[PDB]
Every structure is written in C-alpha cells, then in structure tokens.
Symmetry: C2
Subunit: 442 residues, 2 copies
C-alpha cells in the first residue's frame, strides 16, 4: 500500500485519480517542477518530494526502497536510472513508454532480482499491442494464421474545433511531430518491402481515408512496420502496415513549412529584437522591407501560386510584426509559436480514432476479414481522451501488480492475455469503447 510516481506532467493526473479511489494506497510524487507538484498536490492527497534523477541518485535509492511499486512518467532516456534503483532494492516497476535497447540489456539482472517491470503501456505503444494480440490469439485458438494487419491511429480535435489552417491543436510540444515529416517510412505490402522517402516528397504518400463518410480524414505510414512481425509473431503475413490519421489538409500545410525552410535545426539569425516578418525575409533572401514585398517573395518560393499555403502562414502570423520566441533553433522557434496559437482551451474537446484490419486464413480455406473501431471523446469537466488512453493502461496495470493478479516475472510488454484481457475490459467503464465486425469472402 505505497507507490512512487516519478513525474508531475500531463499523464500524472489521471494516474493519481485512478489509484486514489479505494483509499488504501499512499501516493508519493517526485519531480523537477516545483510549481506543478504544488498545483497537483492541491487536487489529490500526495506526499510531495523535489529531486533530480541523474544528479540525486543517492536519495532515489533510499526513497525507492520504502515503496511497493514505482511508476515512471519521465522521458524514456531516463528509465535505466530508475530501473537500476529498482533491481537493487527489489521493487516492481511500470512504465508508460518504450522499452529501449538500453533497458533491454538489464533483462538478465531483472530476472535474477525476481521482480516485474512492465513497459510499453499507454496508447501507442500500449493499446495497439493489446488490440492486436486479442484478435491474433483468437485466430490461433481455431488454428488460423494472419495474412494481413493494417492499423491506423490518431489523436486530434473534435470536429467542431477543426477550423484552422492545420485542422489541429497541440496537446504537447510539436517538435516530435514536425520532425517525423523529414524521416522515412518502411512497411510490407503483398510480399514486397516498400520504402517511402521523407521530406519534401513525403506528401505523395498521403491517401484519403473513407471508413467514416461523415469524417473527412487523411492517412500516411509510420516510421517502421516491419519490426512488428517478430513482436506479435506473424512472420507468415504478407502485409504489415501502421499509419497515422489526420484531417484533410494537415500534411499540405506542413509541406508548405518545408518549402520555406522552417523545418531544420540551424541557429536563429543575429539592437532591435527579431520579428517573424524579418525571419522570413532572411530565409527567402530579401532584406527586411514591406509586408506586401515579402508576400510576393513568399508565394514565389511556395511552388507556383499556392495561395492556400500563403494564407496558412499569414493566419499564423509568420508574415507579421510579432516577436520570435527565444530558442536554440528555427524548428524550436516555430514549435513554441504553434503552441501559442493552436492549443486547447479550457472547454474544448479532443478525440482519439483507431482502425485495425485483419486478414485471417482459417484451416478450412476461407478468408475472414475482421475490423475493429476504437473511438473516444474528451470530457468537458474532466480528462482528455489522450490523457485517458495514455494514463489508464499504466495505472490499471499498477493496481493489478499491487493486488497480485499478474504472476509473471521479468521485463515484458502487455502481450500476454494475463495483462491485456483485464485492461481491455476495465477501460470500457472509463468511456473507451471498441466495436468489432467480421465477414467471410474467399
């Protein structure tokens, strides 16, 4: 009846809410942010502690030893430090993020210590693993094999808040999503490995997504889908694809930012402070002059007469006299500015959409086409759909370890029926429902 929550950020609130329901558990919180933990301590009954992880490893060892379990909501680079302290004191751990190559090396030490460390919980990774292995295990129960697996996913505003140039509102820092456009995408399709080129030409891979006629969606592939054959155990499959969902026009607007030279890690140009109008003059080539002058230069740079991309920049105030926020690069300067202009208000709803699609070959010979829809909306006077889908799987898994339901030991994901079965059933009560459909056509 004692837990440590390392991290006082976005995901912490729904985790603290779920754990402090019965009343028996005693929650401790450790963080860098002094302002966050005070505001967080007002809402929920917790023991506040202030500490850095990589500098104050001495007190972490003593603090972890007092607890029954340790929940890590920190950046994924810092998990080996938290994992090392857990194996020494013989305490269980749960994580809401990737099991990195660095964390994988400890697996021998974690098994010898005789403790449980559950990684890759949340939305992605997390629910995508659980929904996949539910259907795959159901197929293997009747001797069937997987031929295809297509999975698109996506967090975005509720339709009523989609009227802006990007059709988007940022939950956290845009640096991650903006840099994904420059990266490559790899997947398997009808036997052949397909490579997609990132950067300026990545817009060519964007396709229309019409499974909901009322919802105007687009889609494109993720970083890597070929690694999931080994993870789920479906190397017999001829198709393996994972994608992302957005409203139509999103990627064309980001394509406009790539043309102008805003998506890079070069430093900002050096009496009077720098403005956005002045920054775009430097990028195009002209001197800091009139607003109508740089307008003619900007539209010339943005392909032909692409007024849509020009008006998108004009709307955000990129051809304007506002001050550029201080940052270590041009990309970071844009990211801070987008958080200012396109963030969620107090009463505005977010939304999660997910679409799985399986091609199952039964031993009879026929082909089953199975599809799963998961949809969830944010609450007005409550938690967001993104906060719930990332927070609740990690929180539910922690309660299962304390109550003693998960018997397995070592380092692992949520791939076993012991883990995913109980979690998928409990998220229905929290307002995360998923429907299933199935048809046959050899």
């Amino acid at each position: 009846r004692k837990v440590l929550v390392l991290g006082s950020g976005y995901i912490s609130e729904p985790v603290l809410e779920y754990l402090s329901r019965d009343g028996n558990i005693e929650i401790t919180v450790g963080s860098d942010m002094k302002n966050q933990i005070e505001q967080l301590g007002k809402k929920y009954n917790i023991n506040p502690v202030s500490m850095d992880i990589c500098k104050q490893e001495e007190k972490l060892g003593f603090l972890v030893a007092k607890q029954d379990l340790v929940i890590s909501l920190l950046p994924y680079v810092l998990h080996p430090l938290v994992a090392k302290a857990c194996i020494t004191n013989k305490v269980n751990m749960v994580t809401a993020s990737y099991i990195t190559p660095a964390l994988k090396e400890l697996e021998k030490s974690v098994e010898d210590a005789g403790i449980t460390i559950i990684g890759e919980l949340g939305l992605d990774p997390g629910l995508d693993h659980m929904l996949a292995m539910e259907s795959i295990d159901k197929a293997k129960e009747v001797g069937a094999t997987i031929e295809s697996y297509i999975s698109y996913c996506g967090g975005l505003p509720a339709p009523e808040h989609s009227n802006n140039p990007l059709r988007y509102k940022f939950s956290w820092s845009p640096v991650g999503v903006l840099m994904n456009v420059m990266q490559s995408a790899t997947y398997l399709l009808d036997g052949k490995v397909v490579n997609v080129a990132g950067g300026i030409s990545f817009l060519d891979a964007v396709t229309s997504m019409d499974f909901f006629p009322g919802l105007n969606l687009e889609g494109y592939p993720n970083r890597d889908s070929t690694k999931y054959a080994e993870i789920y155990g479906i190397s017999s499959a001829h198709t393996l694809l994972r994608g992302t969902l957005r409203y139509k026009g999103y990627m064309k607007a980001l394509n406009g930012f790539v043309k102008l030279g805003l998506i890079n890690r070069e430093a900002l140009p050096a009496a009077n402070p720098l403005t956005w109008k002045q920054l775009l003059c430097d990028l195009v080539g002209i001197s800091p002059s009139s607003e109508h002058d740089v307008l003619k230069e900007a539209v010339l740079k943005k392909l032909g007469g692409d007024n849509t991309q020009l008006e998108a920049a004009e709307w955000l105030g990129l051809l304007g006299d506002e001050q550029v926020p201080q940052a270590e690069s041009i990309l970071d300067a844009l990211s801070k500015h987008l958080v200012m202009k396109l963030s969620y208000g107090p009463e505005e709803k977010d939304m999660i959409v997910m679409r799985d699609s399986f091609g199952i070959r039964h031993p009879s010979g026929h082909l089953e086409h199975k599809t799963i829809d998961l949809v969830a909306y944010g609450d007005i006077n409550g938690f967001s759909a993104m906060a719930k889908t990332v927070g609740l799987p990690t929180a539910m898994a922690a309660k299962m370890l304390l109550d003693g339901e998960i018997g397995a030991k070592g380092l692992m994901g949520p791939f076993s029926k012991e883990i995913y079965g109980p979690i998928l059933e409990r998220i229905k009560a929290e307002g995360i429902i998923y429907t299933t459909q199935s048809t046959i056509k050899p």
Copy 2:
C-alpha cells in the same frame, strides 16, 4: 408541488429526470400506452394513469384541477383539448411543440382566465428562438439593426456511426422527413424572394457546408423562412434563410427513392405474402422473376448507370426476399423498414449541430458579422443529444413557473429575456455549450 405529464414517449424521460431532483414535486403521468408507463414507472417515482384524450374528456377536467401545472408531450393536433381543460380549471401549461392556428384562437380566453401557456419549446422550435433573440436584443441594446440571418441545424449520428448508404440513423418515424423532400422551400435573399421546387428536382438546391473542415456536411433550405421576419421583428433584413444539415450523400440516396416511386401514399398491391423484390417488380413494370432481372430493370429506372443508388437499395434489402411490413401505404411500408435497418443501438452516440450567422448594421456605419456554434454529443449511459435539446427547455420552463420566476401572463413563446436568459445559462451545466465569435468588416 404537483404536475401532470401527458405523454409517455421519447421526450418524457429527461423531463421526469430533471423535475424529480429536489424531491418536493409530485409527478403524475397520463398516456395511451400501457407498456410504456409501466417501464417508465420503474425508473422514476410517478403516479400512473391510463386515459385517452379525445374520448375521456370528463376525467381530464377533474385530473387537471388537482395540479399546479400540466406538461403536454402529445401530438400537436391534441393541444386545444388540453388547453380548453386548463382555462376552465385555471391551471398553467407548457408545451414542447408548435403554437398552431387552432391554439392561437384561444388567446382571448387564456388572457381572461389569467394563466400562463408557454409553447414552442425544445430544439426546433425552441433553442432556435432563444439563440436568435439573444443576439437580436444585444444588437438593439446598442441601436443596431439586423441585415441578415442564416441558421442551419441538424440532428445526426456521431461520425463513427455514419458508415451506411444514407449516413443516418432514425430517432423516431421517418414519415415526416421523407415527405419534406416532396414539399417546397421558400426564403429571402438579397431583397428577392426565392422559391425552390420540391420532389425530383430538390437535389439541385443541396450545397456543401464547410464551416468545420473535419466534418463532411451538406445543407438545404427549410419549408419557410419568410415568416420569421414578423416573429423576431426583423423586417428590415434583406436575407432570411433557415436550413437543415446532413452528411454528404443523404439527399442523393433519398433522390433514388423518389425515382423508383417509393415516396407516395398509394396502397400496397394485392396466398403467398408480398416481398420487397416483388414490390419493386410491380413499381418498375416487370413480373415477379429473378433477382438479376429486376437489378437490370432497377438501374435502368434510376437515371443512367447510377450504381451508387442501386447499391443503396441492395444494401437495405429492397431487391430481396424479406417480407414487406403491413401498412396503409408504400411510404409507410418503407418507413417501418428503415426503422428496422437504421436505428440506434444501445451504446451508439447521436449528435446535434447548429450554426447561426448574423449581419448587424451599427449606427456608426460598420458591419458586424456574428456567428454562433452549438454542438452536443449523446451520452453512452444516459440521454441522447436530441432527447436533451427537446426535453430540457420544456422541463426548465416548467420549474420556472412553479418557483414563480416567469411573471408574464397569456399565450406566448420563449422570446422574452425573462424566459430565454435563464434557460440558456442552465443548459450549459447539462452538457449543451455554445460559443460565440465576432468580427468587423464594412
């Protein structure tokens, strides 16, 4: 502390829920349906009564006299019978429907009796009156006049349940909505009166609605918009238009039903019972024969090679061996069949969308363009968005009469600030929020 709710239908549940919160009020229910009032009596504490209105007018007079207020949730043709009983016994009334020409004749008798009768509450009519007069009164507070008023509105499935040929699910009987396609539409636009022809050519008036880029909507005008100049007191306006919202493809599918000859009140054709395949053979002209034969005849009748309309009929089972439900006409037979195929399940969400747009001329000379968005989703384990928007205004208005907030007397709508102000503020807490925006551009 005593109320009679005449009607045990769709709207009754949220009305009974709202009124029985404090506990002081005693609710009585009168209805034709014996099964409904038993099931309704299980959930909420009520006094059940069974009676017909036009046959048992004797007991209605005695029953109404016992109460402080009478809520009528019956068909609008029966309001003069309920109104006549109210004026005799000197009791207040509220209605969730139109104030008809028949009910308007009693206005002299209602004023002499010295009681309040509030009509035209709900969604439409109801909230449309309240949202209109809120903005119009705010304009007249600063000496401004109304030049334009455009109002589109619409109840429909949540985007995730829009994957069917009509992109729709019916809350009640389709007879009303199907017959609106055959009727005309009239409105004012830039000084000139516009008439729109109903029936086969009504599809030409359908336009794209792009105020939410994420939501794929279409729109078309309502029956009559010219009567609203006198109601709101905006005869100076050069534009008056009210429309309906649907997902794209809805009206093209209904256009297909008009071509085949399904939208009419002719009787059904007369050992073996009638099937849908046999009915479409009679309508096209051929004899009851093979399925592929009538398929070639049906596509020939549906304009050129319109496979979309053909597949829509095939999906619903109109070229199939299912039995036709018993009804007094072909339109009624279709309506019953659509309720069977396209109704809401237990866990499926509905949705309400509304969009007002004002052109306000200030005495300075400038033009203010004001817009109001109202959006609401149905609850999973609760009431639908349609049930809430129709039920709660009538229920809230009833509580204001009992508590003694509405001082005005006679027959009236919800046009006064005394009525609409308190209701618009209280619906926010129930999950019906509306945002406002305003810009200037002479």
